[PDB]
Design a protein around this ligand. Sequence first.
Ligand SMILES: C#CCn1nc(NC(=O)CC(C)(C)C)c2cccc(OC(F)F)c21
Ligand SMILES: C#CCn1nc(NC(=O)CC(C)(C)C)c2cccc(OC(F)F)c21
Lengths: 143, 143, 143, 143, 353, 353, 353, 353
Amino acid sequence: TEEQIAEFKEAFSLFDKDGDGTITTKELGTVMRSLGQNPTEAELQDMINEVDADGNGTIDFPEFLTMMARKMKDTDSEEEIREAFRVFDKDGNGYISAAELRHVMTNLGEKLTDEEVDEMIREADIDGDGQVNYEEFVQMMTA
Amino acid sequence: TEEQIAEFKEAFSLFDKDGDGTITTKELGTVMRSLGQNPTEAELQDMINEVDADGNGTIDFPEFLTMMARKMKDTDSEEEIREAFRVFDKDGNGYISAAELRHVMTNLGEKLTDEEVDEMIREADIDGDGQVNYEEFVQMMTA
Amino acid sequence: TEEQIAEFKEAFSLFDKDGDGTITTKELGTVMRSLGQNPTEAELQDMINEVDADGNGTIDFPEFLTMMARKMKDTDSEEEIREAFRVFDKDGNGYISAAELRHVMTNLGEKLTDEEVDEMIREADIDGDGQVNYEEFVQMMTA
Amino acid sequence: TEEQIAEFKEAFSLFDKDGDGTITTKELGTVMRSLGQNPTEAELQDMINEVDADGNGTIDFPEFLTMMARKMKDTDSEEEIREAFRVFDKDGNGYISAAELRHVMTNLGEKLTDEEVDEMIREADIDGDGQVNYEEFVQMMTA
Amino acid sequence: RNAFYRKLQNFLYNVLERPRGWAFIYHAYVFLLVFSCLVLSVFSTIKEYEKSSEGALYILEIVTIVVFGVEYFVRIWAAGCCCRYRGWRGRLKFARKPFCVIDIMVLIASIAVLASALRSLRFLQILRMIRMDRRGGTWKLLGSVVYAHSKELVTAWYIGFLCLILASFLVYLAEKGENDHFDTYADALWWGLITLTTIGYGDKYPQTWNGRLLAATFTLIGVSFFALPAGILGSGFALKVQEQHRQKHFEKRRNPAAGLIQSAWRFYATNLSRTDLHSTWQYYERTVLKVSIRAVCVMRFLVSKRKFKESLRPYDVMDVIEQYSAGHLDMLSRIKSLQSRVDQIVGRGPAIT
Amino acid sequence: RNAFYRKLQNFLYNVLERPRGWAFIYHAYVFLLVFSCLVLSVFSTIKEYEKSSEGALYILEIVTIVVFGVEYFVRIWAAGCCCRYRGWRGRLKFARKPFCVIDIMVLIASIAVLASALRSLRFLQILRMIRMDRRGGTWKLLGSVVYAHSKELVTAWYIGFLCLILASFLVYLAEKGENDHFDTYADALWWGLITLTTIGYGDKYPQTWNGRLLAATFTLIGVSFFALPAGILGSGFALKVQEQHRQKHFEKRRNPAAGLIQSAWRFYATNLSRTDLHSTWQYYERTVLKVSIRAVCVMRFLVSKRKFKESLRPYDVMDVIEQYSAGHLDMLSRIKSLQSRVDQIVGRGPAIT
Amino acid sequence: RNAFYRKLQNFLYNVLERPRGWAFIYHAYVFLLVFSCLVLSVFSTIKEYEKSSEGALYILEIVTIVVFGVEYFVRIWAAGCCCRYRGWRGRLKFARKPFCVIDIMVLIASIAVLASALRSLRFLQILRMIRMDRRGGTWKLLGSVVYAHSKELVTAWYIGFLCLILASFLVYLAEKGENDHFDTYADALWWGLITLTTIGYGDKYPQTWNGRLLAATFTLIGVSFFALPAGILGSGFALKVQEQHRQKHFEKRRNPAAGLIQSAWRFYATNLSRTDLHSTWQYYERTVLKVSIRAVCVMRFLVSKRKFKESLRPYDVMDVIEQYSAGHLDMLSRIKSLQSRVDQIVGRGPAIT
Amino acid sequence: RNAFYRKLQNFLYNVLERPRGWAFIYHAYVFLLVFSCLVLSVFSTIKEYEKSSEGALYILEIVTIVVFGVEYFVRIWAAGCCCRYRGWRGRLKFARKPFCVIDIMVLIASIAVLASALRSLRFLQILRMIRMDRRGGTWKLLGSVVYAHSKELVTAWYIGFLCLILASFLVYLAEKGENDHFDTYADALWWGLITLTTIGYGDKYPQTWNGRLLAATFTLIGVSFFALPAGILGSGFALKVQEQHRQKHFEKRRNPAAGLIQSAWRFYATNLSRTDLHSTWQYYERTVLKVSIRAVCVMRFLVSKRKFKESLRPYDVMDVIEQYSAGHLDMLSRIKSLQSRVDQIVGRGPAIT
Ligand SMILES: C#CCn1nc(NC(=O)CC(C)(C)C)c2cccc(OC(F)F)c21
Ligand SMILES: C#CCn1nc(NC(=O)CC(C)(C)C)c2cccc(OC(F)F)c21
C-alpha cells in the first residue's frame, strides 16, 4: 500500500545515490560494498540483468516495488528448495539429519552463522528430533 | 447454419472453377496462385491428401464444410502450440521475451509482417511486459 | 444362474466325451478338430495350462463356468486392445484408416472372413468415415 | 496408554539387564542370543544404529516406546511389500501362485516354518485359489 | 500325394532358400565341401603335393559339381511354390534376379570349361564363393554401415591420406640420397602405406636420423588414423544389427496385435445372449453347439491377449517410454475430464445453495 | 534474364560451396581428377614409366589447371549473392577468410611455377589436396574429439610413453653389447617405437634372452597402450557425430515451431466472425474472398501442425523424457488445482450443512 | 570337533572351488607356481641354460606335483559337504563332470609319465593349464559373445575372406613371374593372410608396381575387415559382462524381497493385541516375553525393509522406468477409481437437488 | 603486503599444484623443457652428433636443474597455506606423501651425481619423467579400468595365452627340424608372441606348409584375442571418465543446493513485517536500512534459485528420470490425499441427504 511505497522510496534513496530513479550496476555494487559484503562486478551484472524486466542494465522503481512485493508463494520455488534438500538426503528416506545439516551448511557455499543455523533448527526442528523432513520445511517456508 | 452453408457455396464457387463439386489439386494450386502466394505442386498434393477424408485426391464439399466448421478446440492442438513456444524458451523459465519473439519470427519460416507481430503482441502482451508466458497464450488461443 | 449352469452342462457334455468332469488336452484337441479348425498339440497344452487354475493339465467344471461367466470388463484388457490398435497407427494421429484395416487384417494372423470385417466396420464405423478411432473402439467393446 | 507403557517397562527390564535405561548393542545381542536366534555383532550394530534416533549406539526408552507404538501404516511400506511380491511375479500378470510361494519362501532368506506359510495362506488365500494377488495382500496387511 | 508333395516342396524351398538352424547346417556342409575343394586346388597348385592333391581333388570336384547340379534343379523346381513365381513361366521369371543371373553365368562358365585353364578355374572358384550369400545381407550391412558413418569414415580417410602423403614426402626428402629404399617418391609412398597400416614388411624403413624422427612423429599420427576406420566400422556394425533386431522385434509385435484385434472382435460378435452376430456365428459354422463356439472364441481371445502381452516386452528404454507415455496422455485426458466435471460441480453448487 | 540469372548464381553457389548430393558428385569428380593428376605425377617420378606417365599427365594437368581457373572465377562471381558479401567490394572482402587466403597462396605459387621444381610441385600438390575441405569440418571434428577425450588420450600417451622409454632402456641394457641393432640408446628407442606400434619392420629385434623376455613383457603392455588412442578416437568420433546429428534434429524442430506459431496466430487473427483483425486481413489482401482467406489460413495451420508433429519425433530417450516431463509438470499443476478446488468444496460444505 | 570340522570343510570347499578374494589369491599363487614350472621347462629346452634350468626346475616340479596331489585329496574330501554329492558314493558321483574327467585324465597321464617324453610333458603342461578355469566361464563368455554377434562376425569373415582370396589371386597374377615370393598361389595366399592380419613378416611382399597398387588397395580394405572381428568381440565382451552384472543385481534384489515378505508376515502374525497368531507365536517360542518377541519382530521388519530398499537401487534407466511405471499404472487405477466415485457423486447430485 | 602476499602464495599453490588452463600451460612448458633435455641426451648418446648435442645440452640441463630447484623451493614455500600443512612443521609434514618421497629421492640422486654415470642419468631421467603426474590420476584411471573390466580382460588373457602356447607348440612340432628359426620351443614361443601381437619382425616365420597352415589358423584366432585387451581398455577408459564427469556434475549440483537452502532460510528470517528474526537481522548488521537488507536477501534468494536450476540440468537420462520420479511420488501422494478427501465427502454425503 501507500506506506509500503514510501518505504520503497526510502530504500531507493538509500540505493540510488545519483537520483536518476534507476539503481545502476555500479551503484548497486558500491552500495552493497557499503552494506558489509564484497561481491564482483560480473556477478552483479549477471544477477541483475535477468532480474531487470526491460533489460536496461539497471532496475527502475516499478520493477523494484514489484519484486519487493513479489511473495515467495508466487515464485513457486517449493520444488527447487525440496530438490536442494533432496540432494543431501543420500539415503533417500525422506528425512535429513540435523547435526549433518549444521556441519554441511557451516562448510557449504555462503557459510551461515552459528546463530543462523540455530534459528533454522528453532523454526524447522519443531519436532526437536534432529532428523527433520524437508518436504514439511518447504511447505511451511512457502506458506 | 444455413447462411454459413451459403457462404461455403460462395467459397467453393470461388475455388471450384470447373464446377465438379470437388476442389482438385491443380485447381487449388491455380486459385492459390491467384490468391497472392506461390506454393509447389507436391506441397499442395501432400498437404491436401491427408486433409482429404476419403483420399480422393480432392476435397468434396462435405469435407470442406466440416473442416471450416472444425473449431480450434476440437483439434486439441494446445499441446502442439505450447511445445512450439517451449522450443524457443531456452532458459526454460516458462516465459519467452518479446523482442526476442519479434526477431525470431520476422526471420523464421513464413516470415510474418511487422503489423502481424504488432497485433500478436497486442493480443498476447496484455500484461505489456515483453516477457510473455506461452501457456497463457495457448490457453487464450484455444478458447 | 441355474439355466446358464445347465447350458454349461450341455457344453461340457459336448466337450468331455469321457465323462470324467475334466476336459483333457487330448479331448480338447479332438473336439476342436471336430469343430472345424486344426490346432497343434503343444499349442493346446500351453494355451490351456495357464488357463487352468490348479494346473491339473485339464479344466474342471468350476473353472469352465467361472471363465464362461468371466466378462470382458473383468479382464481389463482395454489397454491391450488399445495398444494392438496403436501399433498399427504409424502416423500416431489417434485414428486408423479402414481400408487399411481391412487389408491389414485380411492378410494378418488369423485371417478374418470378409463378412467378419464387414460387421467389424458396421459396429465400429458408426461414423461411417473409414478413419476410425481405436480408443472409442475399445471403450465400446469393453462396455 | 499407561498400561502399554507399563508393558514397555516390562519389556525393557527383560532387555536392559544393566538397568541404565538404554539397551546397549552388546546387551541386545546377548538377550537375542537368549531369545533363540544367533545374529552377528556387526549385524546388530548396523541394524540398531539407524534405528536409534540420536545415534547414541543404544536405544533409550522414548525411542523404544515410540517404535513399539509405531504402526505399520505410518511406515507407508505398502510400496515396499508390493515390490517385494512383484519381483517374484515373473509373468507380470499381477497374481502370484501359492505353491510357488510356499517353495520359494521355504528356501529363501529367513526360511519360514511350514506352519508360518500355512497361516500365510490362511490369511492371504481368502479366495483359496493358490493364485493370490499381492496388491490385496499388501492392502490388507497395512490396514 | 498332393498335399504332402506341396509340403515337401515348401520345406525344400525353406532349406534351399534362406536356411534356418538345420537348413543352415546343410548350407554349412555344402560350404565346407566347396571350401575343401578350393583348399585342395590351392594344394594342387604346389608342385610337391600336386599328384596327391589332384588324386584326392578329382573325386571332391565331381561331388561338388553333382551337388551343385542337383541343388540348382531343386531350386528351380521349388521356385514354383511362390505365387509371384507360380507356374513354369513364373519359375523362368524368377531367374531374372541379379543373383540368379550370377549363378547362371557361373554355370555357363563352368560347363564351358568342362566341355591356361587354371586362371579361369580360380576366377570361377572366386565367383562361386561370392555366390554363397544369395541375400546380399553382408554387402547390404557393410554399405549401410559405411553410409551411416560416412562423416567419421571420410574424416578418417582425409586425415590419414594427408598424413600418409606428407609423411611419405618428408621421409623421401630425408632419405632420397642416403637410403636405397627411398630412391623414388613412389617407394616412399609404398613405405608410408606399409608403415601407417602397421604391416611393416621391413623391405623399406628409414635409416637416417632426420628420416627416423619424421617417421616416428608421422607414424604415431598415421597409425592412429589408419586404425580409426576399423573401429568405426565395428561400432557401425554393432549399431546396425541392433537396429535390425529392434525392427524385427516390432514386427513380431505387429503380428500378435492383429491377432488380438481379430480375436477380440470375434468375441464381441460371438456373445451368446447377444444377437445380430450372424457373420461370426455363420463363420464358425462354416469353419465347422453355440455355447461351445462361444467358449472356444473366449479361449482364443485369452490366448491372443497372452501372446500380445508377451510381444509387448520392453526390449529398450525408449520402447517402454513410449508405451507408458501413451498411458500418461490418457491419464492427462482423464484428469482434464475430472477438472471439467469438478467445474460442473462448482457451477451446480450455487443451485443447491 | 534477371531472376533466372540470380537463381543460377545461387545454384552455382550451392554447388561450388558446401555441395549436397549431386554437388558432392561434382566435387568428387574434381577430386578424382586432381587425385589422378597426383598419381600420374608419382608415376612420372619413376624412371621406367616416366615417358608414358608424362605424356598422359601433361593433358590431365592442363585440364586440372583450366578447371581450377574456371572454378575460382565462378566462386568469386557467386560470392556476390550473399548480403554480407554483396557487391564487388563484398566479393573482395570474402577473400580474407583463411581458406580463401590458402587458395590464393596456392594460386600464386602455381602461377609462379608455371611462369629443382619437382619438390615445389609436390608441396603444391599437398597444399591443393589440403584445399579440398574448405569447411574445416574434418579438422574441427578431430580437434573436438581430442579435446573431449583429453583425459583418456593423455593417460594413454603418458603410460605408453613411460612404457616405451622404460622398455627401450631395459632392452638396450640387455643387448648393448650382444646385439648390433642396439649399439645406441637411440636405436633402442627406435626399436621400441616400431615394436609398440606393432609395425615391426624387423631391422631391429632383441636376440639375447633377457632382452627377449623384457621385450615380451613390455610389448604386451605397450602394444595395448599404443592401440588405446585409436579406439578412444574412434569412440569420440562416433559420439561427436551423434551429438551433431542431435543438434541438427533440434534445429529442424525449431524451424517448424516458428512456422506453427505463425500460422496459429494467423488463424487467430483471421476468424471471419471475429473483428479487429485488420493486420492479418490486410496482410492477406496485400499478398493477393474473405471466406477463402480464412479457409487457406486454416489449411496452413493444419499443415503446419502436421509438420511440427513430424519434427517432434523422439530421436532419443532423453528427448521424449523431457517432452513428456513438461506434460507431467502440467499434470502436477492440474492436480494441485484440483486439490485447491476440493479445498473450496470442503470449505463450502459447512455452508450447505 | 564336529561342527568345527564341517565348517572347515565348507571353508576349504569355498577356497578349493570358485574362490573369492583371498581364495583367488591362493589360486593365483598356485597358478604362479605352475606357470613358473612351465617357464623353467621352456628354459630347460634351451641347450645353453639346460643345466641350471633343470637344477632349479626339479625342486619346483616336485613342489607342483605334491601341491596337485594334496589339492585333489582336499577336493574329493570336501565334495562330500554338498547334499547332491553327500557320502563317499556322492563324492565318486561328483567325478563324472567333464572337468573332473579332464583332471583325472591329466593325473593318469602324469603318473604314467612319472612311472621322447618331452612332447608328452609339453602336452600335459598345456592340458594342466587348460585345467585352471574349472568353471568354463571364459569359454562360456566367448561362445555367448560369438553367438550373440554372429551376424556381424560372419559378415566380417565373409567380406574379409573374399578380400583375402581376391587380393592374393590378383597379386599372384601381378607377380607370378617377376617375384620369387609369389611363384605359387599358395604363397600368394600366405602373403595375403600375413598382410591383411598386418603381421607383415616381410618374407613375401610385392615388388612389381601393378602388384604394389593391387596390394595397396586390397590391404586398405582387408586390414580394415580383419581388424573388425577384434573390435566386435571386445564390444560383445563388454555387453555380455554388463548383462551378467544386471542379472546378478536382480537376483540380489530377489533375495531381500523374500526376506521382506517373510518379516512382514511375521509382524502381521505377531501383533500382541491380535489373536489367532499361534503359528508365529509358537514359532518364536520354539526358536527360543511376548512383548519382547513383538519388539524383535518389528525390528526385523524394519531392517528387512531397509535391506529391500537398498537392493532397490536403479542400476539402470530401464530398471527405474519399470519400477516407477508400476506405480504409474497404480496411479492410473487410482484416478479411474476417482472418476467412478465422481460419477457416483454426480448421480447422487439429482437426489439432493 | 600481507593479504597480497597470501593471495600470491595461494595463486602459486594453484599453479604449482593441480594446474588449470594457464597453470597447465606452464606445466606443459616445463614438461617440454625436460623432454627436450631427454631428447638431447638421446642425441648425445650417438657418436656422430655427440659434440653438438652435448654443446647444446649443457645449457639446457643447467636451465632444467635451476628450474627444478626454484620449483621445489616454491612448492615447499606454498605448502604452508593449507591448514593441514600450516607452519614450517606442517610444511615438513607435507613431504611424507609418496610423491614428495619420490621427488626427494630423485633430488638426492641428482645431487649425488652432480657432486658409468650415463646409466644412472638415464634412470634419473625416467624417474623425473614419472614425477610429472603428481596426482596418480593416470595410474588410478588405469587401475580402476582394469579392475572394473577384470572379467573381460582375464578371459582375453586366458584364451590368448592358451592360443599362444598351443600355436607355438604346434608350429614348433611342424618345424623343429625343417626350419632353423624354430630349433627350440623358446624360439617358437617368441615367434608366437611376435605373431599374435601382429608385430611380425620377420626374424622367425614358418616355412613348412603344415607349419604355415597351423600358423594361419592360430594367428587368426590369436590376433583377434590379443587385439581384444586394447579395445576393452579403451571402452573402460571412456566409461570411467564418463562416470567421473557425472560425479563432478553432481557435486557441482550439491554446492548450489546448499547455497539455495542458505539464502531461502535467510529470506524466511529476514521478512520485514515478521519478527523474532534477530539472528539473521543481527547477522546482516554485523556483516555491515532494514528494507535494504530485505531487498538484498530477496535478490540473493533469486540468484541462488537461478544457480540451483542451472545446476539441475539433466546431463543424463537417469538423472531426469530420478528428478521427475520424485515428483511422480509426490503426485501419487497428492492423488491419495484426494482419494481420502473424496472418501470424507462421500461419508458426509449421507449427512446432507
Ligand atoms: C584412413 C585410412 C585407411 N583406410 N582404410 C580404408 N578402408 C576402410 O575404410 C574400410 C572400407 C570402407 C574401405 C571397407 C580406406 C579407404 C580409403 C582410404 C583410406 O586411407 C586413405 F584415406 F589414406 C583408407
Ligand atoms: C591377450 C593378450 C595380450 N596381452 N595384452 C596384455 N596387456 C593388457 O591387457 C593391458 C594391461 C592390463 C597389461 C595394461 C596382457 C597381459 C597379460 C597377458 C597377456 O596375454 C597372455 F594372456 F597371453 C596380455
